[PDB]
Amino acid sequence: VQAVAVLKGDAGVSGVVKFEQASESEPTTVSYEIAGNSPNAERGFHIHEFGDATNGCVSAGPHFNPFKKTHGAPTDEVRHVGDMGNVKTDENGVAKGSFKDSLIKLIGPTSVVGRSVVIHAGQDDLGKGDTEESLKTGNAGPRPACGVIGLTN
Amino acid sequence: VQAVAVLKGDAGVSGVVKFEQASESEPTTVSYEIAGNSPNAERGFHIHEFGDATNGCVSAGPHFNPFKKTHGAPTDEVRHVGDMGNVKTDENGVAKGSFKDSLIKLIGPTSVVGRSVVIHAGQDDLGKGDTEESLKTGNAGPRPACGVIGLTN
Ligand SMILES: [Cu+2]
Ligand SMILES: [Cu+2]
Ligand SMILES: [Zn+2]
Ligand SMILES: [Zn+2]
């Protein structure tokens, strides 16, 4: 199964995020190409609960957290399903790469199809900051771009 | 369960389409508010197979037709699942209304979540025209606006 999200916003940030999972027990491969970010930085990358674009990126809601855990790093045992950490931007402000993830799924009760992908304006503290907010959002900041995850061929 | 699609394009057409279904056997209520259309006309309204927005409204693919039937009217026995017919625009070019549909579903194997909603620039001939194209698209024409159907609260 394949899915894709086109990140759009009004801050000059945009990109494409592709998802791919063969079966439900298999990990999902996430590939992304995002431009318009600050050069040479880390930017929070997450899947938010709602694929609602009526109110910009705001209506996407909180991080997809069906298991009611606190915010963390993709590699943490305790993290939100939608926690993809930080993406690295080069000197031209382009973030590009891919990775596999076992919590994010395109099949089953926790499918992210129809939900949102959000790129933040700030760095994700991975739930290590000493603030209550660290545990919810990772203090990643504003959401310059987002896209609803849709099915593709 | 509730879902929504925000129709965007570069032709001045835009709107919001909301979906609502309590259980899978129940009909889905579709509500829509679209502006920027030709005044006092009929415009093809359909759910296309892919929620792929990488290539404008083109990448949304054909009408959602899991049962491999020909194009028809919402009331026809033989129609594509995604066949919502024509929406009527007033003197200000606004199409607004709602209806229930038993083929369109937000739950189950034929869920339209993650797929696309497309408003056309032309009138849907409801598969009555005498052209082969009538049976595929209804000769509805160009796709000025579309949106990926996402989950909401
Ligand atoms: Cu986020
Ligand atoms: Cu159509
Ligand atoms: Zn999180
Ligand atoms: Zn059709």
Side-chain angles (χ1 to χ4, degrees):
Chain A
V1 175
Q2 292 180 260
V4 57
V6 181
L7 308 189
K8 293 172 233 203
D10 298 311
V13 179
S14 66
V16 177
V17 177
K18 304 179 162 294
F19 298 84
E20 161 94 88
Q21 181 187 216
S23 33
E24 204 229 305
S25 58
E26 281 258 275
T28 295
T29 295
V30 181
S31 307
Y32 56 82
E33 155 137 307
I34 319 174
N37 311 282
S38 306
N40 306 317
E42 286 186 278
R43 296 300 178 244
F45 198 34
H46 315 123
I47 291 174
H48 288 230
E49 193 178 6
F50 307 121
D52 190 329
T54 58
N55 181 19
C57 296
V58 186
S59 39
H63 293 175
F64 186 38
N65 187 36
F67 306 127
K68 303 197 186 185
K69 305 278 248 254
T70 54
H71 180 81
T75 51
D76 289 347
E77 228 269 78
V78 183
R79 58 172 264 208
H80 295 151
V81 173
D83 288 349
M84 304 186 280
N86 288 296
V87 290
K88 297 170 185 294
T89 65
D90 60 21
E91 60 291 336
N92 299 133
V94 172
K96 184 175 163 75
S98 69
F99 54 101
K100 248 92 74 54
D101 195 83
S102 292
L103 278 185
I104 294 175
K105 298 188 184 298
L106 298 182
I107 304 166
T110 71
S111 181
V112 296
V113 174
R115 307 194 181 272
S116 281
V117 171
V118 175
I119 185 59
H120 292 269
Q123 183 173 335
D124 185 339
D125 73 22
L126 306 174
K128 277 70 182 181
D130 306 47
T131 33
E132 347 72 28
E133 266 292 87
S134 181
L135 295 183
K136 299 188 221 77
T137 72
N139 287 296
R143 314 176 183 186
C146 51
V148 178
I149 308 167
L151 290 168
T152 193
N153 50 231
Chain B
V1 175
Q2 292 180 260
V4 57
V6 181
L7 308 189
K8 293 172 233 203
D10 298 311
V13 179
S14 66
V16 177
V17 177
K18 304 179 162 294
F19 298 84
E20 161 94 88
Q21 181 187 216
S23 33
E24 204 229 305
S25 58
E26 281 258 275
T28 295
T29 295
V30 181
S31 307
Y32 56 82
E33 155 137 307
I34 319 174
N37 311 282
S38 306
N40 306 317
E42 286 186 278
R43 296 300 178 244
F45 198 34
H46 315 123
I47 291 174
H48 288 230
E49 193 178 6
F50 307 121
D52 190 329
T54 58
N55 181 19
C57 296
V58 186
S59 39
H63 293 175
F64 186 38
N65 187 36
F67 306 127
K68 303 197 186 185
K69 305 278 248 254
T70 54
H71 180 81
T75 51
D76 289 347
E77 228 269 78
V78 183
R79 58 172 264 208
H80 295 151
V81 173
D83 288 349
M84 304 186 280
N86 288 296
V87 290
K88 297 170 185 294
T89 65
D90 60 21
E91 60 291 336
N92 299 133
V94 172
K96 184 175 163 75
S98 69
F99 54 101
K100 248 92 74 54
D101 195 83
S102 292
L103 278 185
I104 294 175
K105 298 188 184 298
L106 298 182
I107 304 166
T110 71
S111 181
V112 296
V113 174
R115 307 194 181 272
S116 281
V117 171
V118 175
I119 185 59
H120 292 269
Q123 183 173 335
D124 185 339
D125 73 22
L126 306 174
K128 277 70 182 181
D130 306 47
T131 33
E132 347 72 28
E133 266 292 87
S134 181
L135 295 183
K136 299 188 221 77
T137 72
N139 287 296
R143 314 176 183 186
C146 51
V148 178
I149 308 167
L151 290 168
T152 193
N153 50 231

